[PDB]
Design an enzyme around this catalytic site. Structure first.
Site, PDB file in Angstrom:
ATOM      1  N   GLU A 107      -4.194  -6.746  -1.046  1.00 26.78           N
ATOM      2  CA  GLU A 107      -5.483  -6.221  -0.620  1.00 26.78           C
ATOM      3  C   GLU A 107      -6.139  -5.424  -1.746  1.00 26.78           C
ATOM      4  O   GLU A 107      -5.450  -4.813  -2.567  1.00 26.78           O
ATOM      5  CB  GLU A 107      -5.329  -5.341   0.623  1.00 26.78           C
ATOM      6  N   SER A 125       7.821  -1.148   1.885  1.00 26.77           N
ATOM      7  CA  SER A 125       8.043  -0.797   3.277  1.00 26.77           C
ATOM      8  C   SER A 125       8.314  -2.061   4.077  1.00 26.77           C
ATOM      9  O   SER A 125       7.761  -3.125   3.789  1.00 26.77           O
ATOM     10  CB  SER A 125       6.837  -0.063   3.872  1.00 26.77           C
ATOM     11  N   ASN A 147       5.122  11.149   0.350  1.00 24.31           N
ATOM     12  CA  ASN A 147       5.329  10.537  -0.949  1.00 24.31           C
ATOM     13  C   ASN A 147       5.786  11.553  -1.984  1.00 24.31           C
ATOM     14  O   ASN A 147       6.475  11.185  -2.934  1.00 24.31           O
ATOM     15  CB  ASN A 147       4.041   9.856  -1.390  1.00 24.31           C
ATOM     16  N   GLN A 156       0.827  -1.203   0.000  1.00 17.74           N
ATOM     17  CA  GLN A 156       0.000   0.000   0.000  1.00 17.74           C
ATOM     18  C   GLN A 156       0.864   1.256   0.000  1.00 17.74           C
ATOM     19  O   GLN A 156       0.596   2.208  -0.751  1.00 17.74           O
ATOM     20  CB  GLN A 156      -0.936  -0.062   1.209  1.00 17.74           C
ATOM     21  N   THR A 170       3.305   1.871  13.466  1.00 24.15           N
ATOM     22  CA  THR A 170       1.889   1.645  13.210  1.00 24.15           C
ATOM     23  C   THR A 170       1.546   0.161  13.212  1.00 24.15           C
ATOM     24  O   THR A 170       0.517  -0.228  12.657  1.00 24.15           O
ATOM     25  CB  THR A 170       1.469   2.271  11.880  1.00 24.15           C
ATOM     26  N   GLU A 187      25.326   2.517 -11.568  1.00 26.05           N
ATOM     27  CA  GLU A 187      26.483   3.027 -10.849  1.00 26.05           C
ATOM     28  C   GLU A 187      26.218   3.197  -9.365  1.00 26.05           C
ATOM     29  O   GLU A 187      27.172   3.339  -8.591  1.00 26.05           O
ATOM     30  CB  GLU A 187      26.952   4.362 -11.439  1.00 26.05           C
ATOM     31  N   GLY A 235       3.910  -7.624   5.506  1.00 28.04           N
ATOM     32  CA  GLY A 235       2.894  -8.122   4.606  1.00 28.04           C
ATOM     33  C   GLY A 235       3.311  -8.146   3.152  1.00 28.04           C
ATOM     34  O   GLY A 235       4.297  -8.794   2.789  1.00 28.04           O
ATOM     35  N   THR A 236       2.544  -7.449   2.310  1.00 27.05           N
ATOM     36  CA  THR A 236       2.851  -7.383   0.885  1.00 27.05           C
ATOM     37  C   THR A 236       4.160  -6.649   0.632  1.00 27.05           C
ATOM     38  O   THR A 236       4.960  -7.068  -0.212  1.00 27.05           O
ATOM     39  CB  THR A 236       1.709  -6.699   0.142  1.00 27.05           C
ATOM     40  N   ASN A 282       9.337   7.544   8.091  1.00 25.62           N
ATOM     41  CA  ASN A 282       8.252   8.501   8.222  1.00 25.62           C
ATOM     42  C   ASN A 282       8.541   9.523   9.308  1.00 25.62           C
ATOM     43  O   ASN A 282       8.174  10.687   9.165  1.00 25.62           O
ATOM     44  CB  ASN A 282       6.949   7.758   8.503  1.00 25.62           C
TER      45      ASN A 282
HETATM   46  N1  LIG Z   1       5.992   7.233   3.207  1.00 24.08           N
HETATM   47  C1  LIG Z   1       4.877   6.510   3.262  1.00 24.08           C
HETATM   48  N2  LIG Z   1       4.811   5.405   4.084  1.00 24.08           N
HETATM   49  C2  LIG Z   1       3.676   4.668   4.147  1.00 24.08           C
HETATM   50  C3  LIG Z   1       2.575   5.011   3.380  1.00 24.08           C
HETATM   51  N3  LIG Z   1       1.596   4.116   3.628  1.00 24.08           N
HETATM   52  C4  LIG Z   1       2.048   3.216   4.529  1.00 24.08           C
HETATM   53  N4  LIG Z   1       3.334   3.548   4.862  1.00 24.08           N
HETATM   54  C5  LIG Z   1       4.209   2.820   5.794  1.00 24.08           C
HETATM   55  O1  LIG Z   1       3.999   1.429   5.644  1.00 24.08           O
HETATM   56  C6  LIG Z   1       4.054   0.788   6.899  1.00 24.08           C
HETATM   57  C7  LIG Z   1       3.129  -0.421   6.934  1.00 24.08           C
HETATM   58  O2  LIG Z   1       3.236  -1.154   5.737  1.00 24.08           O
HETATM   59  P1  LIG Z   1       2.003  -1.220   4.709  1.00 24.08           P
HETATM   60  O3  LIG Z   1       2.406  -0.733   3.339  1.00 24.08           O
HETATM   61  O4  LIG Z   1       0.857  -0.407   5.255  1.00 24.08           O
HETATM   62  O5  LIG Z   1       1.577  -2.771   4.687  1.00 24.08           O
HETATM   63  P2  LIG Z   1       1.264  -3.502   3.290  1.00 24.08           P
HETATM   64  O6  LIG Z   1       2.464  -3.432   2.381  1.00 24.08           O
HETATM   65  O7  LIG Z   1       0.051  -2.879   2.649  1.00 24.08           O
HETATM   66  O8  LIG Z   1       0.962  -5.038   3.659  1.00 24.08           O
HETATM   67  P3  LIG Z   1      -0.281  -5.429   4.599  1.00 24.08           P
HETATM   68  O9  LIG Z   1      -0.105  -4.780   5.947  1.00 24.08           O
HETATM   69  O10 LIG Z   1      -0.351  -6.926   4.762  1.00 24.08           O
HETATM   70  O11 LIG Z   1      -1.550  -4.927   3.956  1.00 24.08           O
HETATM   71  C8  LIG Z   1       3.638   1.836   7.910  1.00 24.08           C
HETATM   72  O12 LIG Z   1       4.430   1.738   9.070  1.00 24.08           O
HETATM   73  C9  LIG Z   1       3.872   3.167   7.232  1.00 24.08           C
HETATM   74  O13 LIG Z   1       4.957   3.829   7.834  1.00 24.08           O
HETATM   75  C10 LIG Z   1       2.637   6.120   2.552  1.00 24.08           C
HETATM   76  O14 LIG Z   1       1.664   6.432   1.872  1.00 24.08           O
HETATM   77  N5  LIG Z   1       3.791   6.869   2.495  1.00 24.08           N
HETATM   78  N1  LIG Z   2      37.702  17.778 -18.910  1.00 24.92           N
HETATM   79  C1  LIG Z   2      36.523  17.112 -18.882  1.00 24.92           C
HETATM   80  N2  LIG Z   2      36.343  16.148 -17.947  1.00 24.92           N
HETATM   81  C2  LIG Z   2      35.182  15.456 -17.874  1.00 24.92           C
HETATM   82  C3  LIG Z   2      34.120  15.759 -18.837  1.00 24.92           C
HETATM   83  N3  LIG Z   2      33.093  14.939 -18.546  1.00 24.92           N
HETATM   84  C4  LIG Z   2      33.471  14.171 -17.492  1.00 24.92           C
HETATM   85  N4  LIG Z   2      34.718  14.482 -17.094  1.00 24.92           N
HETATM   86  C5  LIG Z   2      35.473  13.850 -15.986  1.00 24.92           C
HETATM   87  O1  LIG Z   2      35.342  12.431 -16.060  1.00 24.92           O
HETATM   88  C6  LIG Z   2      35.193  11.870 -14.759  1.00 24.92           C
HETATM   89  C7  LIG Z   2      34.027  10.899 -14.803  1.00 24.92           C
HETATM   90  O2  LIG Z   2      34.338   9.893 -15.758  1.00 24.92           O
HETATM   91  P1  LIG Z   2      33.197   9.253 -16.686  1.00 24.92           P
HETATM   92  O3  LIG Z   2      32.871  10.171 -17.838  1.00 24.92           O
HETATM   93  O4  LIG Z   2      31.959   8.925 -15.889  1.00 24.92           O
HETATM   94  O5  LIG Z   2      33.908   7.919 -17.221  1.00 24.92           O
HETATM   95  P2  LIG Z   2      33.085   6.847 -18.085  1.00 24.92           P
HETATM   96  O6  LIG Z   2      31.954   6.286 -17.259  1.00 24.92           O
HETATM   97  O7  LIG Z   2      34.023   5.734 -18.481  1.00 24.92           O
HETATM   98  O8  LIG Z   2      32.524   7.520 -19.311  1.00 24.92           O
HETATM   99  C8  LIG Z   2      34.926  13.013 -13.798  1.00 24.92           C
HETATM  100  O9  LIG Z   2      35.977  13.074 -12.833  1.00 24.92           O
HETATM  101  C9  LIG Z   2      34.932  14.275 -14.634  1.00 24.92           C
HETATM  102  O10 LIG Z   2      35.793  15.249 -14.042  1.00 24.92           O
HETATM  103  C10 LIG Z   2      34.395  16.826 -19.826  1.00 24.92           C
HETATM  104  O11 LIG Z   2      33.538  17.153 -20.670  1.00 24.92           O
HETATM  105  N5  LIG Z   2      35.581  17.438 -19.784  1.00 24.92           N
HETATM  106 MG   LIG Z   3      -2.315  -3.016   2.987  1.00 28.17          MG
END
Ligand SMILES: Nc1nc2c(ncn2[C@@H]2O[C@H](COP(=O)(O)OP(=O)(O)OP(=O)(O)O)[C@@H](O)[C@H]2O)c(=O)[nH]1
Ligand SMILES: Nc1nc2c(ncn2[C@@H]2O[C@H](COP(=O)(O)OP(=O)(O)O)[C@@H](O)[C@H]2O)c(=O)[nH]1
Ligand SMILES: [Mg+2]
Ligand SMILES: Nc1nc2c(ncn2[C@@H]2O[C@H](COP(=O)(O)OP(=O)(O)O)[C@@H](O)[C@H]2O)c(=O)[nH]1
EC number: 3.6.5.-
Lengths: 139, 68, 437, 51, 49, 431, 54, 49, 107, 26, 431
Positions: C71, C140, C228, C11, C179, C254, C144-145, C206
């Site tokens: 559910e 979460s 959310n 949920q 909860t 990465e 449950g689910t 939360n």
């Molecule tokens: N950030 C966030 N947390 C949520 C939300 N809804 C529920 N939670 C968290 O989810 C926890 C409980 O898990 P649930 O997702 O309600 O349980 P479930 O996955 O539906 O599984 P069942 O309980 O069997 O139905 C609670 O402690 C909440 O903190 C939400 O909308 N936003």
């Molecule tokens: N001089 C220069 N350095 C760059 C540029 N783009 C990325 N870098 C450097 O490259 C490093 C990251 O490497 P990355 O491009 O992710 O390597 P790759 O994943 O193998 O392509 C960083 O430390 C940057 O400073 C550029 O346009 N000019």
């Molecule tokens: Mg539920």
């Protein structure tokens, strides 16, 4: 060349902003139309005092008609601004025409046009609240 | 008499509504316009260098002394 | 080419998925009916949405998500909600009975009911994808689910897909906010199952996000919607470099390499800055150095675990907006010269920086202010051994009297899994203290 | 300059068909009318150099 | 107006569209490069072939 | 007709090489559509060093774009000067190694080397002289270090005698940008030492210092960094590409640089460089060009040359000047700074002068130096490597992709031997 | 020599124009595919409502 | 696209719903003969002869 | 039941770039060569005759279903580094036991 | 940010009015 | 004035030959009605090679159409360019072979080969020179393989000295396209070895990758596949129809390739191949044309000449070009890739040059190879044949159509002997 291209880019950006405004108002008062239809159907179900229900429902149907007038206007403006944003140098629709750099007669400000749409939505909301109060009075 | 504003109105339908706002234009486009135009590098800019695109072979049979 | 398949189980997972898919639709300009707003001109003939939304030949952008919950409601709320036309009907899977805060129900009896169907949907989405970057599993540890079926789905995905990247977003149980009563049981069992079948499991909780909403955003009634929304901003800043142009590009494969030093230490923290309101954003400068210091401040954390008590092992900084790499290096070097932030001796090069040009996205009706720069900071402190100790103490406290065990026994697991789960978590704690020293 | 000159001009009169209230003097027509004057001005600079 | 020499490149601070169009891709099992038609942000390309 | 085959691998490679192509195209008068709108015939005389002639005035670059993951390659082909490259020279994977030398060298990166070598073989046998290959890679990454060094090894096996020039963006002293960059840098420099014949070490902190101090620039962005690097790529090829009083190609530069085969790590430099509002204080001349070159501020590596001894140094000037003035300037520098040059080599400066300057500048100068200060960079990488390797951290990610600890041990010992060689040639006396 | 180069360049220009025309026709065919898919969706929305099933 | 060329051919059947094939060849009593010549092409399209 | 390779065309026809990110099914590429003529080793029914070697595997293949899969899966670690010796022994033991469970389910 | 804060304050006032109406129709 | 007669057998043969007559009517200016509307007189100058002349301006093809069902020939007749064929040349039956070689060779094709032979004898005595025969079919079908091989056997009994060409669409390694392909191919190759003068083995999968990678094209369609095949046939036959600086007909081709009588299985190749939008970057030179010939990915069979060894290579440059560029490029490709070339045949490349390129093309080039690598195809076919014949898969059809198992054993023995001689001539040395 650089200045002409860059002015064309600015014009297209402003046209895109205008298109977004048209789309926002289009969707807003289309949603208002949908709520008007749903409230009208609820009022029909409650009607099935009767003369007052007939007057209030007729006011609702007319407000829906005014909203649809506005929706048609914004849809036409949106389809115009679509092709005006889509036109560019490569497009083939580009054409000679006479002097069109004119400001027309009696035009609207953007704030006035948005105010007109806002007043339409506000009047529709007032009619919706009046019909809800009528439904509560019947019940 | 069910309460009108918090009577039957689910949290997701009151919070995860369809997006609608007059400020959607600023999300994808700045209202501030760009304050320049930039052209390409030109011939008066690549030929302002004194004796540009000439080499030392061109002073042979030229008649002018070498002050360069 | 970039493809992330997003599985939301529980949920909590489904509601977080609602928030994040609203955010991605807003970011890519897709209306809730699943179409471009009657124009192909915003962004031109773009296909940057391909990382999240599969596209047919007519303009419908179906997302690459699987919403699973045993559910009914919540998933059916998505079915009958505003985003009804966007989601494919088989993408939303619902069982009859509920897992009822039971890891045994989620893992053995009722979780195995739907797992073949969920794997079939995941297989169709993966075959539709033209090269997967990985899976994003939202759940979460409450129970449950989101615990039993999440662990089962991860276990089967490790069977089927092999070495595919699996990035997890777990609502870890808060230190004192709770909860449920069997949250330690479900958390211990889920962690024991998913030590080996996981890659990198980001933690949020939360209580800390409540403190963030109370202190920064100044919200005295933070519901799950705001929670959310911040989690959606975190995952969007995580995945922004696969779909937006950036100076330093980071992809989904990465985050395991730059944040998992040892195969069992794969539980990183999460932080987002600047989480701020409008009246405070009017006052604060919100510069690169300021938000970089705010990430490492031990009050902006979203895991409710003070990192001054631990040592940083790795960090992944995700800058987005009009941020400059010169000031990025200056701020991230002033942090290294700072003495409050303390690193392990075996990781001198302890940062992975990724800079994206796209500014953060402001949702309408939201709580975050409009900022030009943001950092998503992804730490791997060994301070989380405190949280593991508190959770293990709660587990032993309810386990000495063998309370609530008969539910798990009657629904399909014996005492051996309980014992080996507690043994595995004790071994994990010894691993954390050894990697700290 | 022939292409962007008529990109402006074709865009004006197609935007004169806004039916009742959409005929707006928005901050797009202001830049768009100036584009007609500016491109014709920039044509005259090139034609003066051409002569 | 300026020559292309180290610190003579000015970037636009106004644009915030960006994105990234997926041109180089795979279909069936083969590398199709595909013609790019959209820049960084939906802006038209400086060259159209 | 000494052709040069260009290779850009990784994200940093695909950015820097793209900037390099769009700064070579302006010097050779190539517009974004690929036609030749040139001023003089000197731009067209030696256009075959980097370009292949096509239909009409179209000239297509001889570049190979290698990457295990699309992304920045899509960005550079969607930006300006991105439609000039041939679409068959865009070899891409689908997963990406992603900061993993093992994943870039002994896994799915290795099932792209066939296609990359097919493209390289096409562009290599479509030549007549083929001076050398050059790579623009990124020590510290996955597809820059691993795949790049794999390509270096295979192409060095295929063509042993040709030049194998590399431009390596080395890890930085402060700031990492990658957690596993000591492992990647050590495992890549192990291949670099045994394979490449010349390697230019560019450091991002040095680029930041130059842009922040010599150029101020407030908000530099990576474009200016790539422009600096690209200008120094063009500075070592301008003698091949335009006639001069004293020519020196890449092989002449290598011969007058390296005294021993294991000392091919230079520190590049380009030093006509002023601030925004600083044109009114520096009227550009050969002596201040030389002192800006030999200044420690305008060195594109963190290695301070004052903390070492210049083994050799080459200077490729461009523009209009006097050879007497140039030679007297370098002699004056050598005679004032006697202890900063090795005493068993007289006249450590190799000068070359080309008549054609870069456009805009009256005259420019490119500085490259083989000095013993690069032992500081290699020693820092060794220190971080032995910090990370004692505890076996971030190393299951390599041994599960399929290598062993013996390769890491051999790379560490090779780089320590490199440090020892630089140290023993720093303090070696004449007699 | 000028006539040889002129013949080669004329043949080459004919190649470029033919390939560009073919690519434009391919793009038009792709747009036709999108139009046929939209027409199929409209036909399903019109003639294939669930109430119309017998 | 005017010359014929390898691969430079497009689809005239695009958007067509009828692909009906007529029987141009048949045995009348025992001999094979072209029984067509008055029958259309694919989908009812008219032939030339 | 065979692919027998494609020589040049190994750029395609691998499962990862054919949009199948699961584990490939491995076939016998680079086909062998024989000298000529074969034994008939079968009747007109498809049966294997008396005397020929027969595989001990199941005639219906091996597909362990969801409800007969083992309740514990090892983890696909394939590294065996930075683990304690009891940890490596535990991983090897559970790998052997789960392979035995799959062999039990197959045959 | 000023416009965001202003509309948030207006939404807070509308919230207060709606909750007061609910409390008084209790 | 040397006439050749064209026969099509089966669905594949009928469609491929229909496209072949379409393209060689387009290049000769023949409209679909059958008259002549060509530009120059060179188009009709040697029109007697492929067309017989009726009353008036009608130019009927010299073609025979065989299929056991009306079917595909019905589609061909109700397709474009289908009215040029004489209705008396459509020879058809009633039943149709169900992909059964036994039905196509012994039962259904038995009581139609008399009618086909009468048609062929009439259309060949209508000739004036009668250089030979060419047949299009596949070794994976019922009437393509069995009836085609029966036609080949009867025609070799009739005219034993004329040149025989087969175009032999072989089964593909990947996909299936028919489940009884090993039986059909083993039974047809056993006839093709002892009855064909030259055979171009053409693979659907190799053509798929050619049409989809080197031409992009997205949806390839059998129109373009058969047109690639037809372009290869036109490049083969062109020296009969157009003049050139060094012409070479079918007998020159067969003499200069086939070293030993049972080694006439070739791999064709057509190598102008430009992807959509890369013609701008294309250079259009003789070295690039020869490089696109001598690339392993450009072969129209699955076998790898890099895995094998080339025996004889025939290259026909159809267009205007220079003996310099042609001969030096052949010498250079031989001397560089001397590993993939037999040492006991010095300069094992025949060169032919025409003068008329394709309409819309400046130059074309057809490639024919006789490498020893083609044993891989027969190894694949023979191993699948062993795997089926060990358990007697699908053999009850072949035995119930009145045909024994020793035919299968003899066919397999002949194919294995063919592989044996190919390997022997591959690994045999000079001295
Ligand atoms: N950030 C966030 N947390 C949520 C939300 N809804 C529920 N939670 C968290 O989810 C926890 C409980 O898990 P649930 O997702 O309600 O349980 P479930 O996955 O539906 O599984 P069942 O309980 O069997 O139905 C609670 O402690 C909440 O903190 C939400 O909308 N936003
Ligand atoms: N001089 C220069 N350095 C760059 C540029 N783009 C990325 N870098 C450097 O490259 C490093 C990251 O490497 P990355 O491009 O992710 O390597 P790759 O994943 O193998 O392509 C960083 O430390 C940057 O400073 C550029 O346009 N000019
Ligand atoms: Mg539920
Ligand atoms: N290139 C090409 N191959 C074809 C075509 N039609 C059929 N084939 C091939 O022919 C094989 C089947 O042979 P078939 O035509 O059924 O032979 P038949 O039953 O004797 O007529 C398959 O492997 C196909 O790949 C075509 O139009 N073009």
């Amino acid at each position: 060349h650089a200045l002409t291209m860059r002015t064309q880019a600015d014009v297209t950006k402003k046209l895109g902003d205008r298109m977004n405004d048209i789309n926002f108002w289009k969707f807003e008062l289309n949603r208002e139309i949908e709520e008007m239809i749903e409230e009208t159907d609820l009022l029909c179900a409650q009607k099935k005092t009767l003369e007052q229900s007939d007057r209030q429902i007729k006011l609702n149907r007319g407000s829906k008609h005014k909203l649809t007038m506005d929706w048609s206007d914004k849809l036409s403006a949106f389809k115009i601004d679509e092709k005006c944003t889509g036109l560019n140098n490569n497009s083939t629709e580009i054409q000679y025409k006479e002097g069109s750099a004119k400001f027309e007669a009696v035009q609207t400000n953007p704030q006035s046009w948005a105010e007109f749409s806002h007043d339409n939505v506000v009047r529709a909301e007032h009619e919706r609240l009046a019909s809800q109060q009528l439904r509560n009075l019947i019940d | 008499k069910r309460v009108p504003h918090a009577g039957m109105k689910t949290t997701m339908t009151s919070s995860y509504k369809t997006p609608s706002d007059p400020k959607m234009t600023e999300l994808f486009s700045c209202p501030v316009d760009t304050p320049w135009v930039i052209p390409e590098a030109g011939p008066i800019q690549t030929f302002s260098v004194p004796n540009m695109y000439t080499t030392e072979y061109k002073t042979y049979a030229s008649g002018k002394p070498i002050t360069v | 080419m970039r493809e992330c398949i997003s599985i939301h189980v529980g949920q909590a997972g489904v509601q977080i998925g609602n928030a994040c898919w609203e955010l991605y639709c807003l970011e890519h300009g897709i209306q809730p009916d699943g179409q471009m707003p009657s124009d192909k001109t915003i962004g031109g003939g773009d296909d940057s949405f391909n990382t999240f939304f599969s596209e047919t030949g007519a303009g419908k952008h179906v997302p690459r998500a699987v919403f699973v919950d045993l559910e009914p409601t919540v998933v059916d709320e998505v079915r009958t909600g505003t985003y009804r036309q966007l989601f494919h009907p088989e993408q939303l899977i619902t069982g009859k009975e509920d897992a009822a805060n039971n890891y045994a129900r989620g893992h053995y009896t009722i979780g195995k009911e739907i797992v073949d169907l969920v794997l079939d949907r995941i297989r169709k989405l993966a075959d539709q994808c033209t090269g997967l970057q990985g899976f994003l599993i939202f759940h979460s540890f409450g129970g449950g689910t989101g615990s039993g079926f999440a662990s089962l789905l991860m276990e089967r995905l490790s069977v089927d897909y092999g070495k595919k990247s699996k990035l997890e977003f777990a609502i870890y149980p808060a230190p004192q906010i709770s909860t449920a009563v069997v949250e330690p049981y479900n958390t211990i069992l889920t962690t024991h199952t998913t030590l080996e079948h996981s890659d990198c499991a980001f933690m949020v909780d939360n209580e800390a996000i409540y403190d963030i909403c109370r202190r920064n955003l100044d919200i005295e009634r933070p519901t799950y919607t705001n929670l959310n929304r911040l989690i959606a901003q975190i995952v969007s800043s995580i995945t922004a470099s696969l779909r937006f142009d950036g100076a330093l590009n980071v992809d989904l494969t990465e985050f395991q390499t730059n944040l998992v030093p040892y195969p069992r230490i794969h539980f990183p923290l999460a932080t987002y800055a600047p989480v701020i309101s409008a009246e405070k954003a009017y006052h604060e400068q919100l510069s690169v150095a300021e938000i970089t210091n705010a990430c490492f401040e031990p009050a902006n954390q979203m895991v409710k675990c003070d990192p001054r008590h631990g040592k940083y092992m790795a960090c992944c900084m995700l800058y987005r907006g009009d941020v400059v790499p010169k000031d990025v290096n200056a701020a991230i070097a002033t942090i290294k010269t700072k003495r409050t932030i303390q690193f392990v001796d075996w990781c001198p090069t302890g940062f992975k920086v990724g800079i994206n040009y796209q500014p953060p996205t402001v949702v309408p009706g939201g709580d975050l202010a409009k900022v030009q720069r943001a950092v998503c900071m992804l730490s791997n402190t060994t301070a989380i051994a405190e949280a593991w100790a508190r959770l293990d103490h709660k587990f032993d406290l309810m386990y000495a009297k063998r309370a609530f065990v008969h539910w798990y026994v009657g629904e399909g697991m014996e005492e051996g899994e309980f014992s080996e789960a507690r043994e595995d978590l004790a071994a994990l704690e010894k691993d954390y203290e050894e990697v700290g020293v | 300059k022939e292409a962007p000159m008529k990109v402006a001009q074709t865009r004006l009169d197609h935007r004169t068909h806004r039916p009742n209230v959409e005929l707006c003097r928005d901050p797009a027509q202001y830049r768009m009318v100036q584009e007609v004057g500016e491109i014709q001005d920039s044509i005259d600079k090139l034609q003066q150099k051409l002569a | 107006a300026l020559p292309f020499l180290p610190g003579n490149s000015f970037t636009d601070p106004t644009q915030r569209k960006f994105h990234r169009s997926q041109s180089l891709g795979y279909k069936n099992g083969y590398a199709l490069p595909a013609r790019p038609e959209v820049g960084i942000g939906g802006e038209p390309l400086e060259v159209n072939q | 007709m000494r052709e040069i085959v260009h290779m850009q691998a990784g994200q940093c490679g695909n950015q820097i090489g793209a900037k390099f192509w769009e700064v070579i195209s302006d010097e050779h008068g190539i517009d974004p559509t690929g036609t030749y709108h040139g001023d003089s015939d000197l731009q067209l005389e030696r256009i075959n060093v980097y370009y292949n002639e096509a239909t009409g005035g179209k000239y297509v670059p001889r570049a190979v774009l290698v990457d295990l993951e699309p992304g920045t390659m899509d960005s550079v082909r969607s930006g300006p000067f991105g439609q000039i490259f041939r679409p068959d020279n865009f070899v891409f994977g689908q997963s990406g190694a992603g900061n993993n030398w093992a994943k870039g060298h002994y896994t799915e990166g290795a099932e792209l080397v066939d296609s990359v070598l097919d493209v390289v073989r096409k562009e290599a046998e479509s030549c007549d002289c083929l001076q050398g290959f050059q790579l623009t890679h990124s020590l510290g990454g996955g597809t820059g270090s691993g795949m790049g060094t794999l390509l270096i090894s295979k192409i060095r096996e295929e063509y042993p005698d040709r030049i194998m020039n590399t431009f390596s963006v080395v890890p930085s002293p402060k700031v990492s940008d990658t957690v596993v960059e000591p492992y990647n840098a050590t495992l890549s420099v192990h291949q670099l030492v045994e394979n490449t014949d010349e390697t230019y070490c560019i450091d991002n902190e040095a680029l930041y210092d130059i842009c922040f101090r010599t150029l101020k620039l407030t908000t530099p962005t990576y474009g200016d960094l790539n422009h600096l690097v690209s200008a120094t790529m063009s500075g070592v090829t301008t003698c091949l590409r335009f006639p001069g009083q004293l020519n020196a190609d890449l092989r002449k530069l290598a011969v007058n640089m390296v005294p021993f085969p294991r000392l091919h790590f230079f520190m590049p430099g380009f030093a006509p460089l002023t601030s925004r509002g600083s044109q009114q204080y520096r009227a550009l001349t050969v002596p201040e060009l030389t002192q800006q070159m030999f200044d420690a501020k305008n060195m594109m590596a963190a290695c301070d040359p004052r903390h070492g001894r210049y083994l050799t140094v080459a200077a490729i000037f461009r523009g209009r000047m006097s050879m007497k003035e140039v030679d007297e300037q370098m002699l004056n520098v050598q005679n004032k700074n006697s202890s900063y040059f090795v005493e068993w080599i007289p006249n450590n400066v190799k000068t070359a002068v080309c008549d054609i300057p870069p456009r805009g500048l009256k005259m420019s100068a490119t500085f490259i130096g083989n000095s013993t200060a690069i032992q500081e960079l290699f020693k820092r990488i060794s220190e971080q490597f032995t910090a990370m390797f004692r505890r076996k951290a971030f190393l299951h990610w390599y041994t599960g992709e399929g290598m062993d600890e013996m390769e890491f041990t051999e790379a560490e010992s090779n780089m320590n031997d490199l440090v020892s060689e630089y140290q023993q040639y720093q303090d070696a006396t004449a007699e | 020599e000028q006539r040889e180069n002129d013949r080669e360049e004329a043949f080459a220009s004919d190649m470029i124009r033919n390939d560009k025309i073919s690519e434009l026709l391919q793009r038009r065919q792709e747009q036709d595919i999108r139009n046929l898919n939209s027409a199929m969706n409209e036909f399903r929305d019109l003639h294939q409502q669930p109430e119309g099933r017998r | 696209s005017l010359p014929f060329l390898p691969g430079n051919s497009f689809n005239p059947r695009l958007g067509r719903d009828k692909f009906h094939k007529s029987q141009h060849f048949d045995y009348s009593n025992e001999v094979p003969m072209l029984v067509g010549g008055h029958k259309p092409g694919i989908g009812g399209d008219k032939l030339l002869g | 039941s065979s692919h027998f390779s494609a020589n040049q065309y190994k750029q395609a026809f691998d499962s990862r770039r054919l949009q199948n990110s699961q584990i490939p099914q491995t076939y016998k590429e680079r086909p062998s060569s024989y000298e000529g003529f074969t034994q008939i080793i079968a009747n007109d029914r498809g049966h294997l005759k008396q005397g020929v070697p027969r595989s001990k595997d199941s005639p219906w293949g091996g597909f362990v279903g969801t409800w007969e899969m083992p309740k514990k899966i090892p983890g696909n670690v394939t590294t065996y580094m930075s683990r304690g010796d009891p940890a490596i022994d535990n991983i090897q033991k559970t790998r052997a036991e789960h392979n035995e469970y799959m062999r039990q389910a197959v045959s | 940010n000023k416009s965001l804060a202003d509309e948030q304050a207006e939404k807070d006032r509308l919230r207060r009015e709606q909750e007061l109406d609910d409390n008084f129709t209790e």
